[PDB]
DNA sequence: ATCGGCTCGCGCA
DNA sequence: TTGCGCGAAGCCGA
């Protein structure tokens, strides 16, 4: 294992108990550098490895759709793990308090957690270090090239990060070894409890039917692989040419699995690389899962204010500021945006895709966000509303790719200046008529019309 | 240091 | 649609 994937959080003396993988971002049994390191650390000490996961109360901020998708994954994973003789524990509370307690409770030898740039995981980690005395390690098991290794600074753009990343790919793109089973030796209640709490909040139809259609993405490590497999057989070949067409199902559809770590993106890269197809599609796809996925982790990790105005570049701050007092053609409230009551039937269509499938087509995510800027009273409100809806209804929400993506659309982060406009200033414009030239807009609106109810 | 090159709309064929 | 050349625009890093 490449030791540059390991960061030492808290130095100390190796206790003589088990090795504890605090699993958080990467909820998979396979292709998991964090669980592989733990087992290594375990194996030399002749102790077992165990996995702990903390079900916090953040689930009350989203909906049944994300929380059933996550728990059904953890149920499968639990089985996966016990078959490898690795027990799994599940705590319910504040990771700062519960993990600390647990580590003392079970006399853990060493502590290990996977990596995530989001503000709140570092808060927990800090709290955790004050509460323990054993060594504490962190492993990047989400990125092909560990976030802190790929760059030491905020990258202004893909085209600056891209040479830095591909120089290190030969070293970090590699196969995964086997999760060796242990040698030395309730989730269902939680899920029924959580839904009963979230139920008053369900996104319902007029006839009391749920909006959300749970059949588009089956959750779990197994299903995730079958999705990847299926993208490579049918859709990879056409990806470069039809990726940007909302009327063709030609995306990988991996982002819900990746978000929850139910499959490794290092694995996808390994499998796409070895696939023969259209070079242009492979190149198109690899740029998305390598450059754009991981510069997003770079963004949050070096900009703690990643979900606010002040993280924008100077030029875009200037510009939006200078157009704060422009007359907006339209001003909608969150509640109107939420229910698709704008004047723009293409915009409403894509919000109905969001509402019922929990995954809005990549290209329409750009449109969607910019019309929120154009049709709200201020850039901050735009940011607020676009974050709110993104995180509440996307299956892949509350994710670095989220904040980095919204910042692109509303703030030109990782983007450049365009012709000055009213209201949106120099931020990249997108039009209805421009979509008309690019895809059969009417089909798209047609598909999601019968939903206004 | 000096300037080439970065993930839209639109005219047009 | 489909692709090209052009525009408008701020800045990093050879
Ligand atoms: C307004 C808005 C909001 C969001 C986002 C963009 C925009 C404009 N993104 C990014 C992007 O829209 C999203 O990752 C894709 O829809 C994922 O779907 P597929 O895997 O089918 O993409 P596709 O199959 O084409 O790409 C495969 C993978 O490449 C990566 N990728 C693709 N587009 C990317 C992008 N624009 N930025 C970064 N990585 C990208 C992702 O890992 C994705 O799973 C995001 N992503 C996310 O998963 N959750 C979110 O909540 C958001 N938030």
TrEMBL record:
Keywords: Chromophore, DNA damage, DNA repair, DNA-binding, FAD, Flavoprotein, Lyase, Nucleotide-binding
Domain Photolyase/cryptochrome alpha/beta: 17-147
Similarity-based family: Belongs to the DNA photolyase class-2 family.
Enzyme category, top tier: lyase
InterPro entries the UniProt entry points to: Crypto/Photolyase_FAD-like_sf (IPR036134), Crypto/Photolyase_N_sf (IPR036155), DNA_photolyase_2 (IPR008148), DNA_photolyase_N (IPR006050), Photolyase_Class-2 (IPR052219), Rossmann-like_a/b/a_fold (IPR014729)
GO BP term, example: photoreactive repair
Named cofactor requirement(s): coenzyme F420-(gamma-Glu)n; FAD
Name assigned to this protein: Deoxyribodipyrimidine photo-lyase
EC number: 4.1.99.3
Binding annotation for FAD 2: 239, 252-253, 255, 359, 390, 396, 401
Superkingdom field: Archaea
Gene Ontology MF terms: deoxyribodipyrimidine photo-lyase activity; DNA binding; nucleotide binding
Binding site for FAD 1: 239, 252-255, 288, 359, 365, 390, 396, 401
Catalytic activity annotation: cyclobutadipyrimidine (in DNA) = 2 pyrimidine residues (in DNA)
